[PDB]
Amino acid sequence: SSLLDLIWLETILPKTTSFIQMKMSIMVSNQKGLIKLYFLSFLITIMISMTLFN
Amino acid sequence: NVLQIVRDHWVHILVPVGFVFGCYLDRRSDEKLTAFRNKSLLFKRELRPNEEVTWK
Amino acid sequence: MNPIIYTTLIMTVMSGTMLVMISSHWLLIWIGFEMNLLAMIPVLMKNFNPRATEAATKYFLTQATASMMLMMAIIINLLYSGQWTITKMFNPVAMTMMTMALAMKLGLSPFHFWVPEVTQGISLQAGLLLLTWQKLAPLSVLCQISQSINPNLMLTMAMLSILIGGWGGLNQTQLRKIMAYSSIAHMGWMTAVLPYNTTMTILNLLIYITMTLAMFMLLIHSSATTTLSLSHTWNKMPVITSLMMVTLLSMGGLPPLSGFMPKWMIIQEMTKNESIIMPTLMAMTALLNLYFYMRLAYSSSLTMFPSTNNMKMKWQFEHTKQMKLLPTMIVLSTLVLPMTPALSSLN
Amino acid sequence: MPLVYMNIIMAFAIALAGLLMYRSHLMSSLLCLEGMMLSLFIMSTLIILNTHFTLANMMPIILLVFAACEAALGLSLLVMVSNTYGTDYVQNLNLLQC
Amino acid sequence: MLKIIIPTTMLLPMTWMSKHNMIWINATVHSLLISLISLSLLNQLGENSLNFSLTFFSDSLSAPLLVLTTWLLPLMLMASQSHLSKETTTRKKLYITMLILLQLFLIMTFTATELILFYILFEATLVPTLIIITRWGNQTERLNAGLYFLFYTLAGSLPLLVALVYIQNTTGSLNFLIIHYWSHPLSNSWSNIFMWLACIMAFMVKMPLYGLHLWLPKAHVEAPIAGSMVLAAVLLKLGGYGMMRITTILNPLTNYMAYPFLMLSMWGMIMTSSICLRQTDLKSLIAYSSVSHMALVIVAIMIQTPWSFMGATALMIAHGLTSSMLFCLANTNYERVHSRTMILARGLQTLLPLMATWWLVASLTNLALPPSINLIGELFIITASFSWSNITIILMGMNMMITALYSLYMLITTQRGKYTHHINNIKPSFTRENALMALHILPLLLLTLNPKMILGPLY
Amino acid sequence: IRLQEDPDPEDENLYEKNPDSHGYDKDPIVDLWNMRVVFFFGFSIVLVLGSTFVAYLPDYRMQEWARREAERLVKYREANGLPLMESNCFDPNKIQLPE
Amino acid sequence: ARQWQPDVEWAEQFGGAVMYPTKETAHWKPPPWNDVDPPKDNLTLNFGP
Amino acid sequence: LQYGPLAFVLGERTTRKLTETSKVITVDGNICSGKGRLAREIAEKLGLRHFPEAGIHYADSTTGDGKPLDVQLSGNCSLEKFYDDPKSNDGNSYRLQSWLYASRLLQYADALEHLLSTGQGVVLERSIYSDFVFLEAMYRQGFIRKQCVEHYNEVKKVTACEYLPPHVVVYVDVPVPEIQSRIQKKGNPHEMKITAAYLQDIENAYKKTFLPEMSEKCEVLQYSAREAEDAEKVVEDIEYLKCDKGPWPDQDDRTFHRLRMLVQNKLEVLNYTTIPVYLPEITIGAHQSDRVFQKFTELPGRKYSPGYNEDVGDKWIWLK
Ligand SMILES: CCCCCCCCCCCCCCCCC[C@@H](O)O[C@H](CO[C@H](O)CCCCCCCCCCCCCCC)COP(=O)(O)OCC[N+](C)(C)C
Ligand SMILES: Nc1ncnc2c1ncn2[C@@H]1O[C@H](COP(=O)(O)OP(=O)(O)O)[C@@H](O)[C@H]1O
């Protein structure tokens, strides 16, 4: 009941996936909305697409 | 009060007429799958003197 | 803004998009893009405030950079081919530049930040028009130039768009930012299916436009821009909350609603071309979108949040303005799955 | 392709990089935006004159007109932002967040 | 099948146009009539199924499930009458509409002739269940239960959709008759292993399988009575029906991929029975018993012998009826005392004799008392598992012992002993509740009298 | 306090306002007729009529037909000295092995 | 004895600046209700000799 | 037809209908003064339309039948309870204050709509701009809380940043002892329970904040009781004043069109009065909200739209 069903079966599939998605959402949406920053990101993306794509 | 009875208990025919309509639609769908009627090797049969279709 | 000026600007935006979609000349397509942006900026800046001004400035910068890149790609293609007709581009570098410019115009990752930024900055009608029309045009250009698209780059951008939209929608609370991330994810799906079947691309475009129109018009009807503002709608007009809930369910791809049809058709088309991993990952990633849709639906329809006292006066008064084609868009966004074979008509 | 085209393309790339790397001001961003159009005009006119594309000689004029209209729009937006905030710094454009 | 499908789509407008005080009467009467009409599907052939049209067909496996669904709808209506007294007319009509839509989707799912339509309807059943749970649940955990249920099901089923479209592209058709006649062996390669995994894992998450089952206690505990009745009795059988249908094209790879799932299912029977031994909540006990029975059905389907499919079908029907009856009894006890704790109310045999009799009969049917169809299915599965290997007998024996232990434990805890002194709101049992229990229990004994109707197409 | 919330109402007892309540509805006539229709339809119609219908369903599974055919084949086989059960289901003459 | 419905704590959980608060997000603030931020505020000339 | 962009295109301009007497003469005054009589006198002499002071059943009056609704369905507050127990623990004081502010906002919207649709001036006994004096008086005495004051300030900002300023603080300056004498003579016990400190706080709020604030925007005409008795002098002073005060001189046809579109839509007017700020005084539980809404829908002529209620005598429903 406690060790398997309530702890580890909850930890493997639903809790770990939820934690990963929450961390990724925080990382993605933690932007400060600075045009300089994301235009520099645009420049990096442009260079990567021009060079490492054949 | 007869109108009030009809005005309140007219919903009790919906399911029966739906059942009748479903039976009619089942027959109409069965009439579209008569490609092998009286043509199967197992049930091929000469028609009776007063008969045109083995089944409907 | 004067009503005549407003309708003139709207017609100018529509005429620019129509010129883009009917022109066979790269110069004319670029002219249409320029006209569209020029007439679109005041629509964003209709309701004047610092946030709207900032959103318009960011949108102008992004669209101007994209237009410069697109014109550079056109010139490079002209250098090596001497052709102005919009066909399969004859230079890989020009094709890459054109693809990047069109992705920047659409909002595909990693060119996505301006989409939530501008959508939050501008009002509901401006966001609706922005999403719908400004994604309608570059998708037409991409469909015209589909046969030269680099599948690796296109699919990479599409998958990035799907993932970024899912995670952003997971973390956001503002309705307009949620809509922006939903738009990003759906554009990712469309561009993923683009290099294989432009008919499937157009079908996804139509379904997404219908669902987005329904959702935005419901939000305008309820006059809600945040989660808690929408949480009070059940105490004034519970029908709108239920319609919004079914629309949110449809946008999540749940069968047997209309939103499942684009995903289903795209999966079928991609798996026809011996592509399994990409459809599997795309299908699994939509669960994030469905999660934040369901979280939004909990606060508005399936539960009853606390209300206020002036809601009694709200009950006493009645909505006046009537939305155009709202019931039609609600029906078309939830009950057209049995009419799927019409994609042959769309072909 | 000769080296003049190489130099023009390099100038366009440098102008694009300058636009994508802000320092303090929005005016410099508009200046970098206008340099890209200058490079595009030079490249287009060189290509058209080299190949004797007679009917294409009107394209650079249209490009210049539309880009100048875009520049006017950008200047209007810049002066509105400056009137709102006090400076044309791009740091002030942070009310909206991703 | 239209003669059964159309009357439900007529139940909808009848419900929405009936008077405010006649909705329950009309819905119950016409649901009973539809069940009587659907009883005609039990006249199955011996060699091939009943092919009504290009879209719908009925088999010896589909017919008992359709009859069970059509019979289960009016009982859910009665339970809803019980717990929805103070609801408004529009919300009551919406609840009835959700139940009717769920029944219609289940009927079409069971009678679908193609795998893609089967998938579409089998996923369409999610929406009404989620709405019912998250809207008419009583406690805070209903939202979490709905999220867990929906996401477990979808994470299971999306690779199934990918596999189905791939199979159609590869072979030509997803029609069940064609994929059965034109079946070809599945080679032992990684691609075939992953296709097998996609299909089987989808249906196992739906089943559920041990380790993928937490959504079942979460949803069944927090759902209303009608939701719990439909979740345990019919919605759990979608996975079993799918596995019995989808395994036609997965041989002989099923002979090699079945080991992890067989071990999981048997050890899950043991673990879930042991969990039932020490549960402080009655609904959780019933949910874990359902998990154990479904694990036994999984074992039968995976070993995949003619004696195991008959046992699987019989056990599915019997478990559906028994779990519905147990949930109804637990809901009556809850509605009396407004708490799901099992040791809170005692002496219920002294206070309510007839309910004590119903509890005794339900608990006897749960522990597979002969000659009940529960025991028939369990014994067939045990014999097939014994033929498969000779330690499955040990596992089944210990599972059966623990099952009897926890069934009689819950019976003794709830009904026997000294009544709680401070609980003085135990009113006499209602005629509605007694009739609900009788309508649950009598078909079980009638199917015991005539067992060949629920033994599947391999009889 | 945090809200202007109604207190939790006491649960109503159907037997207080109607000692003859069947538990279906608080209206006496509606409750009585709900009980009557449920009992009549469900028990009488469904149980009795469906049970006898299933009991007297025609033998479409061909169990008795199979028994009669088996009796005929057994009689013919043991009358002529042939084995009761054939060695092969199909004809080796019609089957062509790869060689 | 009645169905549970969300309360002020649930509404406050759902009514922050963003879900899943962190240090920076807690430093952030929700936007104004009407999306109009408060403002943050002649030429003199001495002529003659 | 209904006013809108099509009417504006056709040529229905607001400045065409405006005249010299098209003035929103809000008459700001004090408690229990002759402001109501003075406003009625001014309205008749100048030909303007008089709006009685806004209230709970004023908000109830404009919609449906003019008869007021039950206090449970509308307002959920009473002035008598505020008089009897100002510091009660149910938040009735701030609930009443917020409801009265909403009612005054609705009344101001109605007055603006009437002025912009007919050209006739309007006389208001009190407006949203002078409503904050009661809130300050309550806060000084400790009847309400700082959180209530902050919520009121937020709502007032977001809802009154849109509309045009009032026209005159006709401050009928009556000393507090005279106010108490008038209250005692009137004989209503609930208002007789009003303390002297509460009356002084209202006068302090008027004279220290509202009077200086409105002096910059427009002219302020202050009169004593005896001066306010002579309404002709007040009318003469009103007609005399002329200057470039207020945004009215710079108001344009497009701005008037936008304002008319705003004020003709009542739900847009009362949009930010229900912002999701969960103060215990104004927050209503889900179950109580559901029950009260069900009762309000069960009201006779309010289940459907006004033209679609058969129980109150609406015909041709199937063709409407
Ligand atoms: C009194 C104590 C009772 C409890 C203890 C039990 C002790 C034994 C009691 C035994 C009583 C019955 C003995 C006499 C039985 C007579 C009837 C029996 O012989 O007929 C059975 C038949 O019974 C019915 O088939 C049972 C019907 C079961 C289905 C009822 C469904 C009703 C709707 C409910 C839907 C529930 C859905 C569940 C999933 C399907 C067996 O079939 P069969 O002998 O050969 O039929 C003969 C007709 N022939 C010759 C032409 C073939
Ligand atoms: N914002 C408010 N808050 C609390 N009470 C108010 C508010 N506005 C008006 N009132 C109450 O309404 C009443 C109005 O009385 P009033 O019309 O001044 O009397 P008279 O008609 O004799 O001049 C006052 O007693 C005052 O307490």
CATH number at residue D84: 1.10.287.3510
Which are the contacts of E119, defined by CB distance < 8 A and separation ≥ 6? E157, E160, E161, E164
Pairing mode, if any, of strands H223-224 and H172-173? parallel
Residues E299/E228, Cβ–Cβ less than 8 Å: no
| Amino acid letter for position E409 | Y
Best C120, C122, C226 residue to mutate vs chain G (most G CBs within 10 Å):
C226
Residues E214/E280, Cβ–Cβ less than 8 Å: no
| Amino acid letter for position C288 | L
**Is H touching B (3+ C-beta pairs, cut-off 8 A)?**
no
- Shortest distance between the Cα of C58 and any Cα of chain E, in A, equals 37
Is ligand 2 within 6 A of the CB of residue H131?
A: yes
Calculate the CA dihedral of residues G38, G42, G43, G44 and round it to 10 degrees.
Answer: -120
- Residues spanned by the domain of D71: 3-92
DSSP C317-342: S------SSHHHHHHHTTS-GGGGGG
Task: Write down how long chain B is.
Answer: 56
Which are the contacts of B53, defined by CB distance < 8 A and separation ≥ 6? B34, B37, B38
Tokens 């790609």 correspond to what residue?
C73
For H243, how many CA atoms within 13 A lie in the half-sphere containing its CB? 11
A window 5-44, beta carbon within 8 A of E = 5, 9-10, 13-14
Interatomic CA distance for residues H45 and H30, integer angstroms: 22
Query: Which tokens belong to C267?
Result: 């999966």
SS3 D25: strand
Interatomic CA distance for residues H129 and E155, integer angstroms: 58
Annotated binding site of H for GTP: 32-36, 83, 97, 104, 126, 131, 134, 138, 186, 191
Residues C305/G11, Cβ–Cβ less than 8 Å: yes
Residues A4/C30, Cβ–Cβ less than 8 Å: no
Tokens 């821009």 correspond to what residue?
C225
3-state secondary structure E93-111: HHHHHHHHHHHHHHHHHHH
Q: How far is the CA of H295 from the centre of ligand 1 (A)?
A: 53
First to last CA, chain B: 46
Interatomic CA distance for residues C213 and C222, integer angstroms: 14
Interatomic CA distance for residues H15 and E187, integer angstroms: 85
- The beta strand positions in E265-326, using DSSP E, are none
DSSP H208-242: IIIHHHHHHHS----EEHHHHH-HHHHHHHHHH--
Best G22, G40, G41 residue to mutate vs chain D (most D CBs within 10 Å):
G40
A29: Cα separation from own chain's centroid? 9
Instruction: Provide the 10 A C-beta neighbour count for residue C143.
Output: 17
DSSP C263-297: HHHHHHHHHHTT--HHHHHHHHHHHHHHHHHHHHH
* Cβ-based contacts of G35 with chain C (< 8 Å): 47, 49, 51-52, 123, 225
Report the alpha-carbon angle G24-G33-H72, nearest 5: 125
> Closest ligand 1 atom to the C-alpha of E63?
40
Q: Is-cis flag, bond preceding E252, omega within 30? A: yes
Residues E253/E188, Cβ–Cβ less than 8 Å: yes
Measured between CB atoms, does A47 come within 8 Å of chain D?
A: no
Domain count, chain D: 1
Residue extents of the structural domains in chain B: 1-56
Interatomic CA distance for residues E7 and E22, integer angstroms: 18
Interatomic CA distance for residues D46 and D60, integer angstroms: 10
- The beta strand positions in chain F, using DSSP E, are none
Report the alpha-carbon angle E279-E284-E289, nearest 5: 90
DSSP state, E420?
A: P
Query: Which tokens belong to E228?
Result: 């719990």
Query: Do residue F1 and residue H278 have CB atoms under 8 angstroms apart?
Result: no
Residues C202/G49, Cβ–Cβ less than 8 Å: no
DSSP H60-124: HHHSSSSS---TTTTTS--HHHHHH-TT-TT-HHHHHHHHHHHHHHHHHHHHHHHHHHH---EEE
Q: Is residue D43 part of a domain?
A: yes
Interatomic CA distance for residues D37 and F20, integer angstroms: 91
Measured between CB atoms, does C68 come within 8 Å of chain G?
A: no
* Cβ-based contacts of E5 with chain B (< 8 Å): 22
Resolution rounded to one decimal, in angstroms:
3.1
Q: Is residue D97 part of a domain?
A: no
Backbone torsions φ then ψ of F67, nearest 5 degrees: -65, -45
Q: Which of E242, E375, E229 is nearest to E298 (CA)?
A: E242
Q: Is residue D28 part of a domain?
A: yes
Q: How far is CA E235 from CA B47, C222, E324, H92, in A?
A: 48, 36, 12, 51
Which are the contacts of C60, defined by CB distance < 8 A and separation ≥ 6? C37, C41, D73, D74, D77
Residues E309/E454, Cβ–Cβ less than 8 Å: no
Q: How far is the CA of E41 from the centre of ligand 1 (A)?
A: 17
- The beta strand positions in H111-241, using DSSP E, are 122-124, 172-173, 223-224
Instruction: Provide the 10 A C-beta neighbour count for residue H204.
Output: 14
Backbone torsions φ then ψ of C220, nearest 5 degrees: -65, -40
Backbone torsions φ then ψ of A34, nearest 5 degrees: -105, 120
Instruction: Provide the 10 A C-beta neighbour count for residue H145.
Output: 17
Interatomic CA distance for residues H169 and H25, integer angstroms: 9
SS3 D74: helix
Consecutive H or E run containing A17: helix A16-29
For E84, how many CA atoms within 13 A lie in the half-sphere containing its CB? 26
SS3 E181: helix
- The beta strand positions in H125-231, using DSSP E, are 172-173, 223-224
Query: Which tokens belong to H227?
Result: 């001066």
Interatomic CA distance for residues C108 and C110, integer angstroms: 6
Measured between CB atoms, does G7 come within 8 Å of chain F?
A: yes
Residues H169/H211, Cβ–Cβ less than 8 Å: yes
**Is A touching F (3+ C-beta pairs, cut-off 8 A)?**
no
Residues E444/E323, Cβ–Cβ less than 8 Å: no
Q: Which of C78, C58, C59, C80 is nearest to C70 (CA)?
A: C78
Q: How far is CA D38 from CA C140, D43, F54, H97, in A?
A: 29, 9, 89, 64
Calculate the CA dihedral of residues G26, G28, G29, G32 and round it to 10 degrees.
Answer: -150
Look at ligand 1, atom 47, and give the residue with the nearest C-alpha: F55
Tokens 């007892």 correspond to what residue?
F13
* Cβ-based contacts of G28 with chain D (< 8 Å): 97
Which are the contacts of E150, defined by CB distance < 8 A and separation ≥ 6? C290, C294, E126, E130
Residues D73/D9, Cβ–Cβ less than 8 Å: no
Measured between CB atoms, does D83 come within 8 Å of chain G?
A: no
